[model samples]
Every structure is written in C-alpha cells, then in structure tokens.
Target chain A: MTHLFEGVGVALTTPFTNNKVNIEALKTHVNFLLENNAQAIIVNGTTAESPTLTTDEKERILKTVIDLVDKRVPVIAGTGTNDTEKSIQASIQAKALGADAIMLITPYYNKTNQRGLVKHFEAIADAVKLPVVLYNVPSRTNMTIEPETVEILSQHPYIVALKDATNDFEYLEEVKKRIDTNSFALYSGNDDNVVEYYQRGGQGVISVIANVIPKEFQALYDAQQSGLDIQDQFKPIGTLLSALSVDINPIPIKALTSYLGFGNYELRLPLVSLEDTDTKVLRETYDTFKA
Target chain B: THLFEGVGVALTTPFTNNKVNIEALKTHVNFLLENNAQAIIVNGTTAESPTLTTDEKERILKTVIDLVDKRVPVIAGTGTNDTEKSIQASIQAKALGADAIMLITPYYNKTNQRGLVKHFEAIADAVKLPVVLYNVPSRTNMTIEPETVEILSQHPYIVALKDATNDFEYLEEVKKRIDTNSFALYSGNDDNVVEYYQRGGQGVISVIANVIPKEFQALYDAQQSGLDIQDQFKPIGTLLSALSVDINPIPIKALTSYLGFGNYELRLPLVSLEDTDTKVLRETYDTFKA
Candidate 1:
C-alpha cells in the first residue's frame, strides 16, 4: 500500500478577506496548487494559523480542500492540539472528513519532559488509524522532540514520516542515520533547505513557500528527483521563497497571496500582517520574480 | 516612597488544600526577614503572577503588607499585559500600603519598543508608589530595551528597574544610560546576583532565597560591602541556581517542602518538579550548611 504523501506538499493557507474564512478564495488556492503540480495539500498547519482557528472553521476548511482535491492529490490535515484529549478529538474529526493523513505539532506552552513526550504521541497514534507525521518545530511549541526521541517514535505502526523544522542540519542528518529507511519518510519542514535535504535522503518538503510559489517548489523538487544538478539553480529562488517567513509564518506568505490578488491579507491577533518595511521588501522581491 | 535595597526575595504564594494558605505565607515572610532579607516582593513571577486573579492578587498584597507592617518594604507584582489593568493593580497596591510595585513587561501578545514606553508611563502615572520595572525577556517575549528604560526612568513615579535580562552587557548599558543613580536597579534572576551586584546592581529580586533566605542574605551582605565573597557564597549560590533547575517557584517550593517549612504546592499548568529534579535539589541543599 502506497502512502498518500510522498513528494512536495504545500502547507496551504486559509485565505481570509474580511476576518472570515473566504471559502471561494480557499477553493481557488487549492485549485491553484493542483494546477501547479503540488503532490499533496496540507490545510490548517501552522502556516494556516491553527492556534486562532475554531473547530468549525477547521472542519469547513478541511471539507472544502478534500472535496476540491477529490483524490486528484492527497489532502493531509493539521489536527494536533496541545492537550492530549483535544488532539484525539481533532484527529478523529479530520479522519472523518476524509483527510489522507494528519500532521501533529509538539504540544506547546504546557510542555513535557521525555517521558511525557513518548506517552503523548503514543496515545494520539492509538486513537486514530490515519498515517501520522510528527512535526518538530520548537520555535513555536517551546518543546523539542530530538532525533533520539524521533528514532523511538518511528517504530510505531501508524507513524509514517517526520517533518523537521529546527533547521539544525546536523541533528537532521543524525536522525536520518538512526531511522529505518523502509518504514519512515523524512520531509524538510524548511523552504530554503529542501534541495539540500532531498540530496541527503529527504523525500520532499511540507512547504510554506509552496502556498504562493507552488510551481517553483515543484520545479525544484522535480529537478532534484530527475537527477538534475540544480542545487545552484534553485539557490537564489530558495532564498526568495525563504524570505516570505521574515515575520511569523503565513503573515508574509498571506500578504504575498493578497499581492497576487488571491485574497485579502487579514490575520488574527498575537500575529499581525508584515510591517511596512517587511511588506516593502516582499513587494520588491515579488515584482522581481513576477517580471 | 521606599528605596528598595539589598536582597528582596520574590516570595512564593503558599497554598494548602488548593487555596491561598495565609498562615503559611506569613511564616514564609517572617522566615525571609529573620534570615536577612531586605524586603519582600509578593505576587511576582516567582509567585506565578499569570495564574493569579485580580481579587486574589489584591488579597495577597493586603496580607503581605499588613503582616510585614513596615518591618521591611513590600513590593507587589502589579504588572499585566493590559496597561489599564496594570494601573488598576498598581493603584490597589498603593492603597494597600505596598512600599513599591514590580511591573513586568507584557507577555503573550507582545508590543513594540514604543508600546513598552507607553505601557510603563501609564502605570507609573496611575500610582504614587515607587515603580520598579521588570525585564524578563524569556517569559514575556518582549524586552524593555535600555533606551526605553532611559526614557521611562525620567518619570518621578518610575524609581527603579529589576534587571532580569540575563545578558550582562545589556545590564551594564542600562546602568550606564539610565540617569538617576538613586533609581535603584536590582537583579531579578538569582544565578547572576553576585556578578550583577559587581556590575553595579544594588540587590536581587530573588526566587532561591525563598528556600535558603539566610544564605542569600549573607551573600548579599558580603557583596554589598565589597567583600570577596563569591568563593564562600558559591556553594549556596549554586544550590539556589539548582533549585531553578525547573521553572520558577516549582523547585523552590519543592525545596521548601523538603526542608519541612511548607508543603510542595503549585497551581495548575505549572506542575511540581520531577522526582529526579527533587533529588538533585535535596543533594545540593544538604551540601550547603547555613
């Protein structure tokens, strides 16, 4: 049986026009990814501001994406929450809505030690039969699941992949060396390093840049897969793609989407749009690329 | 307004049967005074300020001030993210007779450097009590930059700064830039107290002192008199630093319980320290003789 997600997946953004989820804009965004050769679509990930989103909004967004994709490509859902009980509930909901897989970020704020980390994931994996990809981005979560922890977690039957974003290449290499190649897939959680990671045995990226520049990311991944030495070719493009995360994730990306006329660049509190300075930089970069 | 000097312990709020145990709190306050603490800072971060409610904070301030009875200055943690709420808390602390108020920089939804100035200016304007600005960047995710402090310290109501930012160079810059020599600057963190005092910090708003009050007092006294006490004080200082091996107040309360002074109690979202952390703390405690 083949896993639904194998190549480059765009961590899709939920477009908001007037502080409400713009369903039409979201559908357009999904169709745009599919047209540009995105292998899969991940909705409600950190790129979508999962923290501020309500349960109903998550379901609606998930249903819309899954229906639009219609098995043309896989649709993975971001279903993890900080609380074990809440994570279970959300994962089950995503499964019922026909998501191909689920991505679980490490519990934030009320963090746990190693013992609690193992128990937290094991319990969630037990609750749902969906293929689970563990997300290890410590910048937001305040907790880290190290390579050693990942090695242990990869043994579970339901755990299929790891999306690593710590940007510590040394540790990522160490994880690659430790895990079983047949059972687990490694995806670069960063935009800039996806090419380098692919060269180092990574399958693909769960990308933030792919939300706007899906073709560019797809081109980069396809070039790598076809044995084209495009590392230098993709380097400048990678730098431009990575710059979209200059502020918080999706703030600059969502603004870039709005610039492309996909939707309005409205974000929730605790996270505002890119500062004027950042916006200017993004606009100049976008124009340079668009030309 | 009181001039806060020497070591001021950011005393822990004691709880029994999941309620604020006033009797235990009094014992904790007296314990610090007898052991050489210069002042008591109640409801600060070491006391778990985030989980506390307005009425609970008011009650804690009233209880500490009434009991201390001017035996030592009492500075209440009256800081909040909302500027108006912080002002309200500070005013309430003043009416309750608190000698000073420690206002932490806003957390969670952090603001820019300009917002930092506005937030403190509004709080200082709302109260007559001496205000000590707190700078713990790790918890709040925002910093009261040195230049902002220089601007904010000009107000008469802003009397001091509790420098918790672990960066030593930043601390030196703060001490050099801020105009008033009388505007006392204390180290809010424990691990760097001796070095902070060496770099011109008057005292510390301490967490470790809650458990080893006498040892901390002795260290502060030696440091204040310009004594070469780092070697002699290193053991106790190391012990206090170890108690902070976990989050604020968790290991301190655990250490206090190990000493039979109070029960090992903490509010939800902040759990008790792990048993391994407890063992490490106990070994450090037993090695350091007061």
Candidate 2:
C-alpha cells in the first residue's frame, strides 16, 4: 500500500552557527540525505529542536529544504504545537511553502485527555489541506493519543498516519487492532524499535539517527522488505544506536552530524551541546561501525 | 526582599463562554487579597497557560497587577520551552508591572542539566525582574537539579524557586546548596506546604489557595506563630487529597466556580473536572470551610 512517507524518513536536524541557522550546512545536509536514499525528509521535528526555532527561522528552513529537495522525496513539515490554532496556522504556512505533509505532535505540557486529543488533532486536520501524521511521543508529552483516539482520527481523510514513539507494543497493538493498517500508515518514531515495528507492518521510521546514517537505515528497510537477514546490517548499528541514547535525540545525533560536517555542534539554549566526554564516546562508536 | 513570604496563589484563569472572564478574575483577586494571600502568580499551569494567547496572558497579568496595586507581588508565568520566547514574555510581564516572573523548566523539548542552567540564566540575564525558577517534574518531566539551582541562585535576578517535585530529598538537597534566606523556595505542591515550610521554604505557590485563601494563609500563619500546624493542616490535607481525584486547576476550578468567580470552565486540552470529581471536590471544600 502507498504511504505518505514510507521507508526511512529522516527527522532532519537544523544546523546552527553561533546560534543562527547555518543555511549552507542545512543545504549540504539536505543534499546528503537525499543522495543517501532517504525516502522522506521530516523538517522541524523534535530532532530539529522545534521548541527553540523562531517562526521566521522555521519558515526559512522549511522553504530552503522544500526548494532543495526539489520534489525528490516527501518533505513533511513538523507544524504541531500545543495550541490547535497555532498548529493550524503553521500547517497552512507549511502547505503554502510546498510541504508534502504536516506532522502533528500530541500536546505536551498542557496536554489533553483522549476526547480532547481527538478534537485537537481533528481540528488541525480539518483546517489544513495537507495530510496529517499524528505524532505520539508520550515520553516527552506526558500524554498519549490513545488507540481509540487514533482510530477516531484515522477516519479523517486528511489524518492519514500516526508516528508512534510510546514504545509500548501493547498500545501499538491496540491501535493496530482498531484501525485498518492498509489505509492508515503507521511509522515508528523510535529508531530502536524500527525492526519490530516493521515486523508488525510499520511503514517506516521518522528517524533521528537517520540524519547521520541515512543509507544504512534505508538499506535496512530495503533488506527487511526483500526478506534478507536484517540482523547482519542492523547488528553493527545496535552499539551505535545504544550510544546515541546516552543523551536525548538531536543531542547525541547532532554530534554525528557535526562530525559529518553539517555545521558546528551547537544547540540552542534549553538544549545544550553534547558534553565532550559523551561526544568522544559517540564518535568512537560511530568509528567502530564504519571501520 | 524575597518575592513573597506566605501563600502565593497560582490562580486559575476564570472563563465564561470560553473567553477569559475579566470580571470573575477581578472578583477572585479581590477575594484572595481580602483573605491575606501574600502574592498572586498569574498564567502559571493552573491558569491553563499553554492554551492562553499572548494578548490574553498580557491582559491577565496587567489586570492582576493593577488590581493588586502593590498590595501583593504579582508574579507572571512567562516561561516556555523556547528561551527567546521566555525572554520576550518575561520582558512583557515586567513592563506590565509584574513584581516577578515564574519560569517553568522547558517541558516537551527539555534540555540537559547544563542546558537548564543556561536556559534559566539567559532569561534571568535578559530580564531585570526577580526570577522564580519553577521545577515541577510531574508536569514538565524535567527537574532543575539541586546543583543547577545552586548555580542559578548566583544570578542577581534569580531570586527564588517554586519546587513541585514533592520529593523531600530534592528539597533538602536544594536547601543544602543555596542560602534559603536569599533564594526563597516556594512549595509548588499544595499537599506538602507544611512540611515544605518546616524545611525552610518561604511559602507555597498554591492551587487550593484559589478556593480557601484565608484558610491556606491561616495555615501558613499558624506555622509561623510557633503553633502546632497539625490541626490547621488536617482539613487542608483532606481537601487536597480529595482534589487529587483529578489534575490541578481541574478540581480547583470546581471550587472557585462554586465560590461565584466564574462558570466552571477550562480551555481545550484541559477539560472541566468530571461531575463525580467535581462533586467530591465541592463536598471536601465545603466540609473544610465548615
């Protein structure tokens, strides 16, 4: 079945130079991902540190990415905010800037209950023309878009997919039980769980690690689909993936991107750069895999 | 001087017909001031801040500051996950005549401990107002570590903290690290204000205070006068336990509405308390008052 973003979609990280968007590095990173066979590009995700990005910055970044991507792959914009109206406005802006789709995260701090979740997501979907990818990362949000809510939201034509990062197979299964996997796409938001998620018919992953290792992830997807032994390719990356978990997403992952020459290893205030010690360990892990 | 010394009510933004009820807000502020609430913290989580527009937040802060009129410190909740936005909101809060600004740790896109220090420091450095660092891991899923607080305490404008961790160890750790005399600590949890005060916290950024401001202040005053607080705290303990049936401001909104402030309402993402939970809260509050 066709999906909004099938296979590995890299949740692109924003490159910064002295706290400003490093547009040159951002362009290079986009080209790097596209050349590496990434199926889709998710812009302004948590991996991109959307919390710290300004509205003008986000618009500029999305436009640059869409223009550079040149319709090679789906350029999904992360427009979801805790405020429904803001999310709607952002999504509309994304659509105008030519985003292929919009990814909506569950409201984080001031979260809603199940009934409220359905309305929040549906309200955004109803307002925008673009397809929606409902993102549920309860670890960060402290609230989940429950299975029933997903089922209810999936029924919306524009609400086409869900990016499940809860890592609760029980929750995933309940959602799978409720909705038809054929029409509604399911993507793993966690990198570690991608294999099992695929085994359970997940379309792809909105990956953080894929920002640095786009080819390996796409190959893993390709191998798994062709009935090849994915464990061989997946094994080397296990230690690398586990090492990245030492810090939050984009923290550890940004070091690898910096090592790859995307830009300086900088994150905005509220998200500091990876400590030197942690960066050393991550660099060693990446070397072991590549060597 | 410290931002405030006794119970600073983290007020619920009253709503009628889904709009911010300005009259009800005035009534609530008057009620708190008449009852001896030491300070007023507007647009904190209890205010449904995440859903509030900037204009609404500015209006609410300005209204509270004007009404309170220096009778009590008016602290505005201005921190968001974004550092720049937090700074902007805080500057606006100060311009609107807020006595202080309470900044919650970045929530959804939380930062590292190093980042935490930087985030708070950047805001404190940007704004000249007294900064109250809020650490509520239950809601934000991020804690301002005692070590980070010790570092942030050195900032000239970072005067206090509003801790809601309910973890005594964390409270003790922070106390050991910072001078409680200068860096005033306020209990963010309503359930632990007595213990918090006994341990050198200046006061509480309280939820229950919205309903029973006089009683809550009396409880704080009772402790201060070297009176045994157990009796004064019992009914409050019972009422808080009952309100635990749902999230804060959810159950508390029921009590405030009952007190004739506004229609019991909350914005999207935060629904009204359930009928049963609301009933329990009203009964518990009434019983406490009786």
Candidate 3:
C-alpha cells in the first residue's frame, strides 16, 4: 500500500576525506538529515558518485546508511550499472543487504535501442524481490526510459515507481495517463521541477539539493500538498538550485554540504570540486536563504 | 612516429558457450597480422567491453599482446566513464605490454566541458602509456569539443584522436588546433576512412577490419600511394552498406564468425544480428574477392 516515500528523499552525497569514504562525516550528515525530518535517503546515486565507487565501497556505504537510518526512512540503494548482469547482481546484493528498494537507471555508453532497453530493465527487475524504482535521466545516460517503456514496466508488482529526470512535463502527462498513480508512484529526479511536478501529480522527489536543505525541501512538499500558494516560498529555493547548476549535480551541491560541515567539499575524480569563485557565489546564495 | 599509420582492427572477442574463445582469438590475431593490420585494439565498443569482466578483458588483452609479439602496436580500450577505473585498467594494459591505450570520452555520466579536460588529464597523467583519445558522439551523445581536443592534445602522453563523429567540420577544427606531426588523427568510423585519410587522418580504428583486414588496409595503402581509390571502394561500399543493416559489431560479428572465429556470438544488451541480415552479410562477404 506504500510507495517508497511521500516527501523529499535526499539523494545523499558520499562524504569523502583524503580520497576515502568519510564514515564519521557521512554519519553526521545522515543524522542531520534525519533530524531535519527527511522523508527518505537515496544512497549511491549520481549525486553520490556511484560511477567512481567500487562494489565494496557501495555495499559498505549502503550498509552504513541502512544501519544509521535504522528503518526510520526507506533507504533506496542506487544499484544500476550499464551492464545488465552487474546490475542484477548489485540489486540482489542490495536486497540481501537490507535495502528497502533499488533504483535502476537506463543503460548508458554502450547503449541499445528500445528493444534492448526493455530486456535490460526487465531482466534486473525480475531478479530481485524488492521494490524497483526506474531512473530516467537522459542528460547523463543519453538514453531515455521512454513513457511507453514506463507503461509496460509499471505493470510488474516489483516495478513500483519512477524517478523522472527528463523534466519534460508533457512526458509526465504521458506517464500519468498510463500508470495508476496511487499504485505506481512518481518522484521528480530534478530538484528545480519538483514544485511544478507536485502540482501535476508527482508524489515526491529524489533530490540533490535536499542533501543540503532537507527540512526546507520537506516543508515545500508539505506546503504544496496542502494546496497552499507556494510561489514566494519556492522562489528562493529555486534560485538557489538554479545557481547550483553552475556546475553539475553534486559538484555545487557538495559545496553546500561542506558548508554545513559534512565533508571538505571533496569529490572523486571525473567530478571535480567547484572553483573558488563558484563556491563564493554558492555561499552568497545560501546566505540569502534561511535554511 | 604515428601510433599507427594504417588500419587498426577493432578486434571482436570470439565466444563459444558464452565464454571467450582463446583459440579463436589467437587464430584471428594471426589472420589479421598475416594480412596486414597496422594495430590491434582489444576490448573496444566493438569488443562488447560493456559486458566483459575485468578478468576476461585482461585475458583478451594479454593474449593479443603476446600473439602480436610486437609486430604491430596492440592498443587496449581502457577508458571508462569512471576515471579511477579507467586509470586502473589502463595501468593493467600497460603492465601487460600494451603499446598504447584507446580512451573513449566519458559516456553516460558525462561531465561538463571543463570536467571533460579533468577526466582525460587525470587518466593520462595516472598512466604513462601512449593515449589515443576517442570521440564518438553518436554512442556517447557527448562530444570532446574541438577546443577540449586542443587542451588535451597538449598532454605528452595523449598521442592521437580517434574521430568517429564523421563531422569534417569538427575534424577540420581539431586539425586547426593541434600539430598533426605531434598528435595523430584516426578515423573511428569505417565509412569515413577514405575521406578521413584525404583530410590528414593517419589511420582508422576499424570494426570492418575484423572481417576484411587485407582489403581495408589495401584501401588505406591505395589511397596513400596516390591511386584513384574509386574501384577499390566500389565493392567496399557494398560491404559497408550491408554492415549498416544493424548497429556495429552486431553485423560485424556475423562476418567474423563466418570467417571461422566462433559462433556468431554477442553478449547481453547486444544480441546477434537477425538471420536475414546475416544472410546478406555472408552473401556480400562471399562476393568480395580480397
């Protein structure tokens, strides 16, 4: 009867120190989010640099988060890889490791046509018993989990939700038209679009910005769901997200997390830290907003 | 000297019973070397690297490095979207005696224009192996912009560009920035080999070369030796058209298997070419007299 979660699910950043996962920093960060009333915790997403993480690192991180969250929130593990077999193994491993759900992103790099996409997703979903959340971020993957694919995958009981990052509202309408929204939930993968997404039937967000400002994001979700006028309340948050886009996901957002004393604004290679100027701009914008 | 000056076969892994066929790979390596492959690139996109495990990749690269025995450069396809993994794999390839490494641009979780530089530089800096920069926007959906190519070409270890975009304007712009004498250019697209050669590309990292190593190299040589390659390309044009019936390595696998490598096998996410397409590939392959 339950979707993964109903409000803001922070796509938690991996706190790094001196080129290793900073477990103490990560514990403090998770404690801060939970204390701030975060609805769910999404571990090892792109925001967490899942690409750079090894299987051992990912498993350890997930286990740590699952233990810390202590079932207070549904901790969704990001187990998707471009390889289907690896993805299935990761999903099965995540299930055994006590993940409430697992997220599968569409294959990237060595991508396939639509037919291969169907087979790839279904193969992994069929392998695991836990709830599956399909992630469709075409900007990063260059492949879309199309609306039609959504209609087909949502029919599987295990395939329970979608984190739509395409940000095309028309696409949202297309998906909404097909799925029974109550049974198969929708979470906005993009933070900027969550307010409009909520306005148009999205249940929650798997958010990057929420890693920094979990309480405010949750309150916005609350404000929107209660049918309050949310324009002024959402304005500053939207501006902050827009400013954060000066770099890719987790790059600018990690600075804010560092500002909050999570880690030293560290990121793995292929994802660099922000320049001093960009950090200055982000701090100014953060000062303007009362988190 | 250039890393390679003719066709480097983007070698396919031959599989039997869903496992790598070591004997078939050795035979295929000898076949290409006997005919005249200027370089051997293992574990590329055409090799179904996305599906290969680290152990399999290491086995395949080691086999080729040993089989070729320094007759030609063996370039290992090592770049991945993960910078650290790419470095590790590249270092492994170097330890296995690979002459160079071919790095595809960060695909899937692609970075910003600035991040692209960082990703490539980190890998190139980490592994001192000669680097071949691969830019295939068709597959990656992200391009190493001409300016970024300029920035990366400055690295002493970054030796060449494998331009698969098939965009002449991009090729021209890239040529404008870097010295061809110092940094080589290669055509990654099999279709653009002739024009790419004419445009100052030194070689091709060719998928078709897996099947027609002799003919593909002859085309390069004939074009290089200043012969009008119109007749040479006519049969190849038909062969290329037939291979286009499906995405790369899909159709090419059927032809390689037809050449007696192994069963027409490909890993998951990439199925074997359809029966009708295989018939066309076989019929077209038979008609061409290499």
Candidate 4:
C-alpha cells in the first residue's frame, strides 16, 4: 500500500467557541493549511486534546475535516488510547467515517511490556483494514516503542509509518535502519528538527507549528528537497515556534492561534491557558513574524 | 517467609489542614504497633508519595522510625521514577534508620525488563540497608516480571518482594522459584491479602490497616496461625477494599477523619472523597468496628 503521508502533515487543532466545537473556525483552519500546501490533516490528536474529547465530538470533528477536505488531502484520525479495546473501537469508527488511516499510540497510564506492545498493535491492525501509523512520544505516555518492538511490528503489512516524538535522533536512526524503506516511513514529530530529519532520510513531519505556519514549514521541506541550506531562513521561525511549546503543546499553540485571530484560546480542564510569562513570550515571538 | 512474615501496614501520613499531623501520626503508628501490626510503612503510595517533598519524607521517616523504636519494623517508601532520585531517597531512608526501604520499579518512562533489573540492583548496591522491591504495576504502569524478580532477589541488599501486581499465578511462580528460608514475599495490595497468604505469601503491606488496624491484624494473625479464618475476615477486607474504590488515601483519609484521629484533607491533584463514596466508607467503617 502506498503511504499517503510523505510531506508536512498538520496536526490540526480543534477550534472552540463558546465552549463548543467551532465548526466554522475549524473549516477556516483546515482551509488555511490546505491552501498553504499541508500534505495531510491529522484530527483529534494530542495536539487536539484527544483525552478530553467526547466520542460524539470526535465523530463530529472527524466528519467535519473529512467532508471539508473532500478528498483533497489524506485525513488520518487519532484513535489511540490506554485501553486497547477502546482504541480498536475508535479505529473502526474512524474507518467507518472515511478516514484514510489511523494513528495508534502506545497505552498510557496503564503501559505494557514489549510483548504487550506488540500484542496491542497487532490486535488493532487485525481489527481494521486501514493503514496504521505508530505514534511514540514517551514524555507523555511514559512508554516508548523500543527499536526491537518497532522492527517486529513493522513486518506487519498494515503497519506503514512511525510518527516519532521521542526527540532522540539516535533511536530514530536505529529504527530507520532496521525497517524496510518501501514499507516503512518515518515522520519527525518535533517542529525544530524537520529539515535535519529530512537530511537523515525522514519522509516528513507531523508538526504543531504547521497549525499556524503551514506555508513556512512547506518551504523548509522544499529546501530539503532541493538540497539547499534553509536552516538560516527556518531557524528564526523554528525559534519562534519553539517558544509556543514553552509550556505544554496545544496550550501555548491554542493561545497563539487565538492571539493571531484564528479563534479563542479555549482549553479543557486539567489543562489551562498559558501563564502570563509564557503568553507574553508567545505573543512577542508571534509578533516578530506577523505581517 | 523471612522478611515477609507478619502484618505490615503502609501507614498513612496524617495531615491536618495541609500540615503534617505529627501527633495524630504518632498515635496511629503506636496503635498499629500495639495492635498486632508487624511493620509500619511510611511515605508509601497510601501516604501520597508524589506530593511529598524530600524534607517532608525525611521528617515522616524519622518520626515513624523513632516512634516504632525498633518495637516493630519500619519501611520507608523511597522510590521514584528517576533512578538517581531513588538512590538519594534510599540513602536518606537508610540514614533515618528505617528497617527497609521499599523501592518501586520506575513508572512513567518505563524501560526494558533488563533496565528494570539494572535499576533495582543499582539502588540496592548503593545502600547498605535491606531493600524491599515493590511491584505495583497498576500505578507504576510497569510490572516486575517473575523472572525479573528472581534476578533481583539474588541481590544481597534486596531482601523482600512486595507483590502488588495481584497476579496470583505469577505470584505463586515467584514463590516457587525464590521462596527461600530467608527472603520474604508480602502482598502490597489489600484485596487479596488472605488469598496471597494462601499462595505462600508471608503477610501483607496493607493500606486497609490504616483504619481497621485490629481487624487486619486479626486476619494476619489467623493466616499466621495457619487457620482458615479468611471467611471470618472476608467482610472487613471487602469493606476496606470498597473505601479504596476512589483514589488512594482520599477515602482512607476521610475514614481517618471519621474515626476522630485526623482531619479530612488531601493535597492538590487529589481531591477529597465525594459524599457518596464518603457515605459508603463510613458505613463500612462502622460495620468493621461493630
């Protein structure tokens, strides 16, 4: 099966207005990314607060993105959770909603061993026919899909790509070396390291900065493709983007989007708005690049 | 059944209006020691290990160890996700004269099983004191496999296994392999204390003992006597298990307050028990007392 994600894919944020799904704002955000050359759109991801979202909200959001994209871009849905059974159920739901692929995160809070990890991913792959991209971000989940486990799971035909947020290039390269290039693709999950990842043979990035600056991220990709040194051009933008994650992702990113007049800085509980210092830093950084 | 013999309670750290309720804590520890409780575990999961600062853990450890005065064994919860932090906590716990330091497997950023064995061996080698390896997979999100337990049990400093994972088959297997005359195996969970004892476990590091010390002590005594009195204590054990239906120490703290020993308060990220859970807990407490 051909991988749909080969370039910059935006982990699209769900916009909220008046404590509800701001569909108009979401459409506007999707339109913005597509117009700026985002290769794909990932909905209800961690950057989109998958933990707090309700089942109905997830379905509505997926449908809104899928319908709005209208086959223009590949739509991958974040249907991963700590419960393997629930993850499979959500994956089936996403597939039913016409999602092109499903991103499965390793179980969080109730993490399992490498044996359990292999079993968990295999069960999900067997349950659905769609392609699966394994998402590994240990800082949040407290578990990493080890290189050996990845090498084992990658043998499955359904397991296609990896969205690696580990920020450990050594491990990433190890995983890249073990898997077959045709069946497996690696996407950098950190914004600052996209071009460097490309230099190391990464396919693309699943980026948070792509939420606000999709075109600029695309230019960095273009530079890598053309074998040009665009780090000088992308460094300042990467620095400014890095400031947005001064707090947790989505917290500062949501607030920065609101400040840029995309939508309100509304976030669910257990996660609040950015602190004054962080907000000030994000605002100053965004102002530096605002036309 | 060496180190694991006898009833040990993972004693609650009493707090009054956000400060350490030292007097209440002393009274509680004395109650456990006098009421057939074999060991007292301080600063454990039931004591809100994460919310406790280093100074607070040290003070609690000192107070408990001193109050026990070698009358009963005192184990300190000195485990954290970071190995370096665990070493520091274990050294401080040893310095405080704790009988044993309960070191949990790394949670959050879990490593390979080889890493798990290495992590425990590093801490055990760093301190001269005996280390009780804690395996509570429910909270740490990782388990100390039976094979890993066998490897860690061979370490001289590692003396006991607190099996909190509640997997009886693995527990029995661990017992079959490592159950020597000197090494101990205790159940760190409350729900299966008696059944675990039946599976060759020596005793339990109990949370329910915080409220019904006498009843849990009776259960431990019955098991020690090789009497099938599990049916007699099943009601109380089941009651205490219900109080833990919410999060740890929330309902247990509320029950402590109801018993007029301490106030009903918990730190942030952990709220007090709701009225419904509180009502059920109180009913269970009254029933256990009766």
Measured on C-alpha atoms, candidate 3 has an lDDT of: 0.89
Q: Order of all candidates by DockQ, from best down to worst? A: 2, 3, 1, 4
Quickly count the clashes in candidate 4.
0
lDDT tens per residue, model 1, A1-291: 445566689988878887789899889888989999999898899888766576889999999999999989888898876556668789999999998888987755445565567777878888988899899876555568878889888889988888888778898888988897567988888888877788887878899877878887788888878889877888667667757757667778877888766778776643567777888799788777756
Off by over 4 Å in 1: A1-4, A12-28, A39-45, A49-102, A107-113, A119-131, A138-143, A242-248, A266-272, A275-278, B1-145, B148-162, B180-184, B217-232, B241-250, B259-277
CA lDDT, every model vs. true structure: 0.78, 0.89, 0.89, 0.80
Give every collision pair in model 3.
none
DockQ of prediction 2: 0.69
Superposition error at B161 for model 1 (Å)? 5.2
The sequence of per-residue lDDT tens digits that candidate 4 reaches over residues A1-291 is 577767899988878887688888888889989999999999988888766566898999999999999989889999976556677889999999999999998765545557667878888888987899999988766678999889999999889999999889899878987887667989988887876788888889998888988887888888878879876877788778778756666777887777756678876543467767878788888778765
lDDT of 4 at B115: 66
Task: Give the alpha carbon lDDT tens digit for every residue of B243-280 in model 2.
Answer: 88766667788988999988998776567877887888
Model 1 clash pairs are none
CAPRI-wise, candidate 1 is incorrect
For model 3 the local lDDT of residue B272 reads 80
List runs of model 4 lying over 4 Å from the truth: B1-290
Q: Which ten residues in a row have the lowest lDDT in candidate 2 chain A?
A: A228-237
- TM-score of every model versus the real structure: 0.74, 0.95, 0.95, 0.55
